[PDB]
């Protein structure tokens, strides 16, 4: 039950500020060191900062010095990354991580990451269109079009349909908006009788859609 959970990422304009939090359970950050590591879309890992909470000792990558500050609150078992003067190139998923035991130099548990997007563009929720299917296997899906920023999640039949599902990485259109498809393959003979629903969630715009996909008449 060692756990790190990040929050606070989202869309922020160039030059703005944002504070990330990393809530630890199953261990006390006061017994160890906490770190932030980031990863720009499609790129490698870049170490950002670390702190020894018990005495406040901090160190930073040169690329963030003077803009980011790492801190911790041992009474809340939480660490923070205050980020100011944000630039496009700070866009990334940001992970917090720890060392354990007295095993220095080994990031043994990480959080799941929180996306930070630095852009002037506005939030936009997607439109959801069916990809309609026509004793074999048929394909169907949902086109999830024109949204910003990332991410969107898609499930099928509220989680009951996971086999044969492919949800594609989004692509950035020349419009500056993202688009993605989710497809699934199913028995052709289930088509008259089995309901297929794609569940789309674009948290950034608070847009949930449940789209029934069926054979066109």
């Amino acid at each position: 039950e060692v756990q790190l959970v990040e929050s606070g990422g989202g869309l922020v304009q160039p030059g703005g500020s944002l504070r990330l939090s990393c809530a630890a359970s199953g261990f006390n950050i006061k017994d160890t060191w906490i770190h932030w590591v980031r990863q720009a879309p499609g790129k490698g890992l870049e170490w950002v900062a670390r702190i020894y909470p018990t005495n406040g000792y901090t160190r930073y990558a040169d690329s963030v010095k003077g803009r980011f500050t790492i801190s911790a609150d041992t009474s809340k078992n939480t660490a923070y990354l205050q980020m100011n003067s944000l630039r496009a190139e700070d866009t990334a998923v940001y992970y917090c991580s720890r060392w354990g035991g007295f095993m220095f130099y080994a990031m043994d548990y990480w959080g799941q990451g929180t996306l930070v997007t630095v852009s002037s563009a506005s939030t936009k929720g997607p439109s959801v269109f069916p990809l309609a299917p026509s004793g074999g296997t048929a394909a169907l899906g949902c086109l999830v079009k024109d949204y910003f920023p990332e991410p969107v999640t898609v499930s099928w039949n509220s989680g009951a349909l996971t086999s044969g599902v492919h949800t594609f990485p989004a692509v950035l259109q020349s419009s500056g908006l993202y688009s993605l498809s989710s497809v699934v393959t199913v028995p052709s003979s289930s088509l008259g009788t089995q309901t297929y629903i794609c569940n789309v969630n674009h948290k950034p715009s608070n847009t949930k859609v449940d789209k029934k996909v069926e054979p066109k008449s």
Binding site: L45, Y95, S127, A139, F168, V171
Partner: protein, 218 residues
């Protein structure tokens, strides 16, 4: 300053192969300074996971097929018998310096037997056509290797520059890929034409396969 170079930056190997990735310090470093090199595995959309620490110690719970070693300023990660689930990017990390740095990553793909794509074509929905736009989608499903060519034609006109492709990450169990090709047209252009066709070339097919529809037929 001190960096690690990993090589190769990518590779494909078959299940059961022995794979070895190398990490080299960008300069000479006295023996007196310890690098405490760690190796991490990163799967698509997940946090990295620790594999190896202090050069060669196996992290608790990591499969024994993974091992590391180093001589001087060269470090190696070895996967003794590659499994389909080991598709990932692998990163080394050096702690000679504070801050420590990561290597640039090595992407490992699982080589499997050729598999032809299943191909499907989807016309735009009437719902989208109301908006003024038409997306036409071509799906290539569960194929290997990753390389594929998709050519769009609208009444025999080759479409160039108005499509975008997305490919899934290699499947962690069957080692295949899927691919979507999306053609974007104005509503007006879509309704001036009849025959919508995607033509797929892939090593698992003996010649190019075409899926098509005629606008307004079912």
């Amino acid at each position: 300053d001190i960096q690690m170079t990993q090589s190769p930056s990518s590779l494909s190997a078959s299940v059961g192969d022995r794979v070895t990735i190398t990490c080299r310090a960008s300069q000479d470093i006295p023996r007196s300074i310890s690098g405490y090199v760690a190796w991490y595995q990163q799967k698509p959309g997940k946090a990295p996971k620790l594999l190896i620490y202090w050069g060669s110690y196996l992290y608790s719970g990591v499969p024994s097929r993974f091992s590391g070693s180093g001589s001087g300023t060269d470090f190696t990660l070895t996967i003794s018998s590659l499994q389909p689930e080991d598709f990932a990017t692998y990163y080394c990390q050096q702690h000679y310096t504070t801050p420590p740095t990561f290597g640039q990553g090595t992407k490992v793909e699982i080589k499997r037997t050729v598999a032809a794509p299943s191909v499907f074509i989807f016309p735009p929905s009437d719902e989208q056509l109301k908006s003024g736009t038409a997306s036409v989608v071509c799906l290539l499903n569960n194929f290997y290797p990753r390389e594929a060519k998709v050519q769009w034609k609208v009444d025999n006109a080759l479409q160039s520059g108005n499509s975008q492709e997305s490919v899934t990450e290699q499947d962690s169990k069957d080692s295949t890929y899927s691919l979507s090709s999306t053609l974007t047209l104005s509503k007006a252009d879509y309704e001036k034409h009849k025959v919508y066709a995607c033509e797929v070339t892939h090593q698992g097919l003996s010649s190019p396969v075409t899926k098509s529809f005629n606008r307004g037929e079912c």
